[PDB]
Write a structure and sequence with these properties.
This is part of a larger assembly, with seven protein chains of seven kinds. Chain B has about 60 residues and is an all-alpha fold. Chain B is about 65% helix and about 0% strand. Chain B has a single domain (about 1-65), classed as Ubiquinol-cytochrome C reductase hinge domain (Helix Hairpins, Orthogonal Bundle), CATH 1.10.287. Chain F is built from two helices and one strand; from the N terminus they run E-H-H. The chains are: A mainly alpha (about 100), B mainly alpha (about 60), C mainly alpha (about 55), D mainly alpha (about 240), E mainly beta (about 50), F mainly alpha (about 80), G mainly alpha (about 375). The structure holds 1,2-Distearoyl-sn-glycerophosphoethanolamine, heme C (HEC) and protoporphyrin IX containing FE (HEM) (2 copies). It is classed as electron transport.
């Protein structure tokens, strides 16, 4: 029951493929004005690590080579870092909507 | 004045599923000849055995020309 | 490796020399390639073309 | 009611760099001129096409001076016939389409320009048609229509013309059934594609060009993308 | 003329099985055939239009 | 979108060597063919199993179309 | 300083062709813009030569085309180059639309709408051009698809006896189709430049879908020589088809002249409408069929307004990747059903293929995006 769901989530994260290129969960986020706001509200060192991981991912899709096995960012050691910023952005957007309604 | 068509056609149908389908054709033709004006045309057998003989002659026709 | 040094030194240092080089190469290569492909297409049949049977006729 | 598919034949122009037998084009034209030029038309081919393919210039001028043309007016201007050197097509044995249909027992015959290239199959269809007359096993055959399996409907208003009154080729090539049928099939392949010889010549030259050129363009692509394949990053913060 | 499985007419465009009088049985045709204006004259003739 | 106001990136050093002095195809049959075998393993689980179902549907449709084209009564 | 940055035309040429900030991880699917453009200029040029040797008159149109193929020097190479270039044009177009749907480039709205208008324009141009040689299949396919446009209730009847130029397909219909087969590819060129304009406004999309604003490289001399390589492969395939197999694509029923009384049973149009023509006869209803065709390409319109994912690519949604390849299998099934006659097993699987078509694009891809929305703490 419990770990069966965990088995599904860990298998899907292995078979996604972005972990093989040195990415974490919040380096492949779709951008609207909300997520552009959340990226604008980041700290500095995480933003520098974000642009470095993105630049390595674009290099390793430029020569289309996957990282060796030992440097793949596995499940449950990644940072789910963008979640509170993006959460507050969506809360403020719904706040504007449901206030002007 | 004998064409090589006749020679290689009568040669290639000698003993084969060609001959089995010819006897199947004679089965359906006797079946309708012992029947008062049925629908059974006995023609599908003609198509597939002459298909067989024409493939096997198609392998071995244009060499002798 | 020395054979490409004088080639770079005489036909690739300039630009106009490079252009004259590829033009002269284009004409010479056009002649040689048309003769070669004509020889290949004659050799690949040798019994079917109109040319040899018409000078037999 | 079925579709019998024609077989596959090892033609002498079957290979992708092979051409027609021009001698077979000559004797296939002899077949068309002897026996086939009374029901069928071939109105998109002139005698001047044959000036370099399977005849010389003088021979085609003789073959086009054998036939009247009915050229147009003169000074008084009714009409008048004409020998005609090269500017004439192959002249129309039956003038109108329905006059051709009423001359036959209905079912006017199609013209022989695009038959090879227009029958869901190559000249194998024409060969198996022209050679495959046989016995009808208990079918209708409405009073004039013959049986031949290589045709949709199995009822053809064409009397089988290929061996009946053999045409006696000029060269002395022995007139069997298969040889005269192969000759007229080669000639109909030629009348379908007048450019087959030179198009396979340019196909050979294009194969040599794209075998000699395209690896060099790929080399130059890799040579200009060679920098970004080898660029290497490093991370300096304080 | 005389195609299909019902004996009668048959449209080869989208498999419309007509009957011998030309009426739609199996296909995407909603309507039947059109009956034109015909006038029989005793010369074994008919003016049709 | 011009060229120079895209984003703001610090902390990144890039090395890249001249195109002439490096070779054109770097060990083209020592990394390339295991590379394309890697890419082939990572895809056909999601590429093939539609196509073979299409192929079976194709052959089944042809086979049953002929077998319902031909009836064979007996009388 | 530089002529390339001050001259008013060369500002446009520099900002579109050299100093363009392009992403750095393009795979071979980003060639098909240049391939469609070079196919377009090739089709325009060969078509202009064909239009110099063509006489649109229903007595001598087919004889004029035969005159082109036999008597004019290399006119056969230009004719076969035009026809096979049209088929390769639609090959490159469907590769282009497949890239644009699969890598999530449909989050760009205005470029996508201009694209769909270009799709309609190329389809109408292909249909009019296929009418123009005035053959058997050309004549009857013109009749069938013009009656498809007559399926519109209460407006379509006068509309179709209008675009027939009368009450049947006549000299006027051939000359109308000639004039519009001439003028529509230049509208295709202008809308291609507007398409290019909005794409240069928004910015391109890399295969990852990660925004590549950190790693832009210029266009030249990288993508110029990559697209020269792609066009050289395209010219290889086009010369290969026009020099070895013209029989591979052309419908042999076409080559008989347009007898207005034959109607052969083999009645299929040219293959790149058969993914669409089989949608028509899947429905045993007229207005439902023509509306389902229009609604298929309007489903291609309303692709972005169902994008309920949270990562724009399909490289990291493997279930949507599987359903995409099931959709490609379904379209090739529809093409094969378009190439077959209309009887019982083909009718059953054509109905099921069209219903699975709309069920895959409309329903199951947003359902898969929702299940990976909900599976990854989003
Ligand atoms: C088609 C032949 C098969 C091509 C194929 O297998 O491509 C594999 C490739 C995998 O993509 P992916 O795994 O995301 O990327 C790996 C990069 N490191 O996948 C790709 O490259 C996919 C990109 C092309 C997708 C479309 C190809 C077919 C074109 C027609 C599509 C029609 C779409 C609908 C149009 C009418 C509606
Ligand atoms: C008059 C008798 C002839 C002669 C001397 C030849 N043909 Fe044939 N032909 C004739 C008719 C009346 C028809 C039409 C039959 C029908 O409408 O079904 C034909 C048909 C053909 C075809 C058509 C096959 C098809 O439509 O798929 C071909 C290819 C053909 N004829 C060839 C042909 C050749 C090569 C001949 C010279 C040997 C020839 N015909 C003689 C009437 C006649
Ligand atoms: C404005 C430029 C164009 C002109 C002047 C032009 C002209 C012609 C002409 C005169 C024909 C009839 C000749 C023939 O079919 O043998 C023709 C046929 C055709 N054209 Fe075009 N054309 C143009 C652009 C295009 C484009 C952009 C396409 C689509 C890719 C296209 C697709 C076709 C097709 C499919 C045929 C039928 C070919 C055949 O089956 O023989 N044309 N065109
Ligand atoms: C008339 C035929 C078409 C031409 C000539 C054409 C041309 C181009 C060109 C030159 C590009 C830029 C190259 C590239 O970005 O890879 C492009 C990109 C694009 N086209 Fe088209 N296009 C055509 C049809 C379509 C259609 C039908 C659509 C779908 C609606 C479409 C959607 C797109 C999209 C989404 C992009 C952006 C891809 C990206 O930059 O990531 N195009 N097109």
């Amino acid at each position: 029951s419990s770990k069966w769901l965990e088995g599904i989530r860990k298998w899907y994260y292995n078979a996604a493929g972005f972990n093989k290129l040195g990415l974490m969960r919040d380096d492949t986020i779709h951008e609207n004005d909300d997520v552009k706001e959340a990226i604008r509200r980041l700290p500095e060192n995480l933003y520098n690590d974000r642009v470095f991981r993105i630049k390595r991912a674009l290099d390793l899709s430029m020569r289309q080579q996957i990282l060796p096995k030992e440097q793949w960012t596995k499940y449950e050691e990644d940072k789910f870092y963008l979640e509170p910023y993006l959460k507050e952005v969506i809360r403020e957007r719904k706040e504007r909507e449901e206030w002007t309604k | 004045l004998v064409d090589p068509l006749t020679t290689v056609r009568e040669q290639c149908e000698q003993l084969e599923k060609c001959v089995k389908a010819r006897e199947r054709l004679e089965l359906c033709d006797e079946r309708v000849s012992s029947r008062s004006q049925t629908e059974e045309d006995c023609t599908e057998e003609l198509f597939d055995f002459l298909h067989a003989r024409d493939h096997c002659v198609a392998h071995k026709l244009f060499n002798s020309l | 490796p020395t054979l490409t040094a004088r080639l770079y030194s005489l036909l690739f240092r300039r630009t106009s020399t490079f252009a004259l080089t590829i033009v002269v190469g284009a004409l010479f290569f056009e002649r040689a390639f048309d003769q070669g492909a004509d020889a290949i297409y004659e050799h690949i049949n040798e019994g079917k073309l109109w040319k040899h049977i018409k000078h037999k006729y | 009611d079925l579709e019998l598919h024609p077989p596959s034949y090892p033609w002498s122009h079957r290979g992708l760099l092979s051409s027609l037998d021009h001698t077979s084009i000559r004797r296939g034209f002899q077949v068309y001129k002897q026996v086939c030029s009374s029901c069928h038309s071939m109105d998109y081919v002139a005698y001047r096409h044959l000036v370099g393919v399977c005849y010389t210039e003088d021979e085609a001028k003789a073959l086009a001076e054998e036939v009247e043309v009915q050229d147009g007016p003169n000074e008084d201007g009714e009409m008048f016939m004409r020998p005609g050197k090269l500017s004439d097509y192959f002249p129309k044995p039956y003038p109108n389409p329905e006059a051709a249909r009423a001359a036959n027992n209905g079912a006017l015959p199609p013209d022989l320009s695009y038959i090879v290239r227009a029958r869901h199959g190559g000249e194998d269809y024409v060969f198996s048609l022209l050679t495959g007359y046989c016995e009808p096993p208990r079918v209708s055959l409405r009073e004039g229509l013959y049986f031949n399996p290589y045709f949709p409907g199995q009822a053809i208003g064409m009397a089988p013309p290929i061996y009946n009154e053999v045409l006696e080729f000029d060269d002395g090539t022995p007139a069997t059934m298969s040889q005269v049928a192969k000759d007229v099939c080669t000639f109909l392949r030629w009348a379908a594609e007048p450019e087959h010889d030179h198009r396979k010549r340019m196909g050979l030259k294009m194969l040599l060009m794209m075998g000699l050129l395209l690896p060099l363009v790929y080399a130059m692509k890799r040579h200009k993308w060679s920098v970004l394949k080898s660029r290497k990053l490093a991370y300096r913060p304080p | 003329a005389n195609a299909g499985d019902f004996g009668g007419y048959y449209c080869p465009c989208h498999g419309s099985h007509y009957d011998a009088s030309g009426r739609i049985r199996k296909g995407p045709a909603p309507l039947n055939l059109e009956v034109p204006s015909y006038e029989f004259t005793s010369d074994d003739m008919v003016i049709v239009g | 979108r011009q060229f120079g106001h895209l984003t703001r990136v610090r902390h990144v050093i890039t090395y890249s060597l001249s195109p002439f002095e490096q070779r054109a195809f770097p060990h083209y049959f020592s990394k390339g063919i295991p590379n394309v075998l890697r890419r082939t393993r990572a895809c056909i689980l999601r590429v093939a199993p539609p196509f073979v179902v299409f192929y079976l549907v194709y052959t089944w449709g042809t086979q049953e179309f002929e077998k319902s084209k031909r009836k064979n009564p007996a009388a | 300083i530089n002529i390339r940055k001050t001259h008013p035309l060369m500002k446009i040429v520099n900002n579109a062709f050299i100093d363009l900030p392009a992403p750095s991880n393009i795979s071979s699917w980003w060639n098909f813009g240049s391939l469609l453009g070079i196919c377009l200029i090739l089709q325009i040029l060969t078509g202009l030569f064909l239009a110099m040797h063509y006489t649109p008159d229903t007595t001598t149109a087919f004889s004029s085309v035969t005159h082109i193929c036999r008597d004019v020097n290399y006119g056969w190479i230009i004719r076969y180059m035009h026809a096979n270039g049209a088929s390769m044009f639609f090959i490159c177009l469907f590769m282009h639309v497949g890239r644009g749907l699969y890598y999530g480039s449909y989050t760009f709205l205005e470029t996508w709408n201009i694209g769909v208008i270009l799709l309609f324009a190329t389809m109408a141009t292909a249909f009019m051009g296929y009418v123009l040689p005035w053959g058997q299949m050309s004549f009857w396919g013109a009749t069938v698809i013009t009656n498809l446009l007559s399926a519109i209730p209460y407006i379509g009847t006068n509309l179709v006896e209008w675009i027939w130029g009368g009450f049947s397909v006549d000299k006027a219909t051939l000359t109308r189709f000639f004039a519009f087969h001439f003028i529509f590819p230049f509208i295709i060129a202008a809308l291609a430049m507007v398409h290019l304009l909005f794409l240069h406004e928004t910015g391109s999309n890399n295969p990852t879908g990660i925004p590549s604003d950190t790693d832009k490289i210029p266009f030249h001399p990288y993508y110029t020589i990559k697209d020269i390589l792609g066009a050289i492969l395209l010219i290889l395939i086009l010369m290969l088809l026009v020099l070895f197999t013209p029989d591979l694509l052309g419908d042999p029923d076409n080559y008989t002249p347009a007898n207005p009384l034959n109607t052969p049973p083999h009645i299929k149009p040219e293959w790149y409408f058969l993914f669409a023509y089989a949608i028509l006869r899947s429905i045993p209803n007229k207005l439902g069929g023509v509306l389902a065709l229009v609604l298929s390409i309007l489903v291609l319109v309303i692709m972005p307004l169902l994008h309920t994912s949270k990562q724009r690519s399909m490289m990291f949604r493997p279930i949507s990747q599987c359903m995409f390849w099931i959709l490609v299998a379904d379209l090739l099934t529809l093409t094969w059903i378009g190439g077959q006659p209309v009887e019982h097993p083909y009718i059953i699987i054509g109905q099921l293929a069209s219903i699975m078509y709309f069920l895959i694009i409309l329903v199951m891809m947003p359902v898969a995006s929702i299940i990976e929305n909900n599976l990854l703490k989003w």
